[PDB]
Amino acid sequence: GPNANPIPEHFFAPYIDMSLSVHKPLVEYAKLTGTKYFTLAFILYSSVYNGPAWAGSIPLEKFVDEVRELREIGGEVIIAFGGAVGPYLCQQASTPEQLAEWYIKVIDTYNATYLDFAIEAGIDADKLADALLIVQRERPWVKFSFTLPSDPGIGLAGGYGIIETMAKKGVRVDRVNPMTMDYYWTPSNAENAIKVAENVFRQLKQIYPEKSDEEIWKMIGLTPMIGVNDDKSVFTLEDAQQLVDWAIQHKIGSLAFWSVDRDHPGPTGEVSPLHRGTNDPDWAFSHVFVKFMEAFGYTF
Numbered sequence: 380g381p382n383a384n385p386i387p388e389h390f391f392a393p394y395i396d397m398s399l400s401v402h403k404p405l406v407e408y409a410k411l412t413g414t415k416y417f418t419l420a421f422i423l424y425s426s427v428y429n430g431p432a433w434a435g436s437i438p439l440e441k442f443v444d445e446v447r448e449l450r451e452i453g454g455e456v457i458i459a460f461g462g463a464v465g466p467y468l469c470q471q472a473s474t475p476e477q478l479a480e481w482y483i484k485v486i487d488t489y490n491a492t493y494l495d496f497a498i499e500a501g502i503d504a505d506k507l508a509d510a511l512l513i514v515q516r517e518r519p520w521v522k523f524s525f526t527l528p529s530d531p532g533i534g535l536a537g538g539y540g541i542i543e544t545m546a547k548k549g550v551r552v553d554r555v556n557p558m559t560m561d562y563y564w565t566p567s568n569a570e571n572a573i574k575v576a577e578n579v580f581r582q583l584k585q586i587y588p589e590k591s592d593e594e595i596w597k598m599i600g601l602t603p604m605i606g607v608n609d610d611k612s613v614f615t616l617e618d619a620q621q622l623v624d625w626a627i628q629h630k631i632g633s634l635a636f637w638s639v640d641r642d643h644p645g646p647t648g649e650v651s652p653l654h655r656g657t658n659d660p661d662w663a664f665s666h667v668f669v670k671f672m673e674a675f676g677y678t679f
């Protein structure tokens with residue numbers, strides 16, 4: 380379309396922390412990473428603007444022109460809410476109507492076709508669901524992704540309750556994207572990400588028993604944290620390749636990672652938003668993950 384492009388059936392849309400001073404134009408990231416799809420992080424509640432803003436403080440409309448330039452090369456975005464630090468819109472809103480108004484403002488500002496709710500903190504899932512019922516009614520072309528904490532012993536944690544609530548309320552669930560990272564008791568590697576995927580598969584089958592195996596895998600995305608994780612385990616380039624190959628084999632819906640600006644070598648084991656604390660060359664993880672899309676027709 381004019382001001383929105385198709386996202387492939389099997390896509391890779393890594394997270395960009397939009398608040399960083401190092402922020403490049405999205406078109407430049409497309410050239411460097413090899414993907415022209417990104418998840419833009421994060422919209423939070425800003426007290427200053429009394430509504431949505433990047434990192435809860437940066438004007439909502441700041442990146443509109445970057446998104447239109449990305450669309451000129453056929454790229455497209457997913458807009459993410461939430462993340463590791465609040466306050467979330469869904470926490471601050473007094474009513475589902477107010478919450479829906481805020482989500483819709485973000486949709487309309489970016490002509491968004493896909494929203495991602497990266498819900499790490501405790502929330503009122505009922506209030507979220509009621510807002511999303513309004514959103515999907517008023518903006519029926521917009522897909523909803525839910526990006527949630529996960530663990531290889533359980534799959535989704537409290538996030539499972541969020542999906543259960545969405546399903547029962549009749550809120551569309553286009554993507555369930557466990558964050559396969561930061562378990563603390565066991566390392567963030569390919570083996571554990573695959574265990575998470577299998578657990579989430581079983582979880583979604585319980586919610587949606589009428590869906591085929593392939594329908595369930597299509598709903599699933601996986602998001603590791605590249606290189607050093609907050610718990611000091613390391614998701615290596617070898618882990619990345621193994622996970623990509625598993626993901627291709629299982630024809631899952633998507634991959635992403637945290638994060639684009641971390642795809643640079645850095646001092647060993649140091650946690651930073653600007654590098655990944657491993658020695659792999661610039662953009663190495665990006666190029667491996669792009670292979671997931673390439674298997675299914677993508678070329679850039």
Ligand SMILES: CC(=O)N[C@@H]1[C@H](O[C@H]2[C@H](O)[C@@H](NC(C)=O)[C@H](O[C@H]3[C@H](O)[C@@H](NC(C)=O)[C@@H](O)O[C@@H]3CO)O[C@@H]2CO)O[C@H](CO)[C@@H](O[C@@H]2O[C@H](CO)[C@@H](O)[C@H](O)[C@H]2NC(C)=O)[C@@H]1O
Nearest residue numbers: 462463464497526527528529530536558561609637651652
């Ligand atoms: C898309 C997604 O929301 N992205 C981010 C996600 O946040 C992780 C937290 O950072 C992490 N906390 C630290 C202390 O480890 C958290 O770990 C918990 C697990 O969720 C949890 N497991 C589940 C099953 O309950 C539990 O067992 O323990 C751990 C520890 O409490 O995990 C979440 C993901 O679930 O990951 C990135 C990277 O950390 C995070 O990025 C940070 O984002 C903030 C803004 O929110 C930026 O200011 C930071 O710069 C950025 N850090 C990195 C180094 O760039 C996203 O928010």
Ligand SMILES: [Mg+2]
Nearest residue numbers: 460467468469
């Ligand atoms: Mg929110």
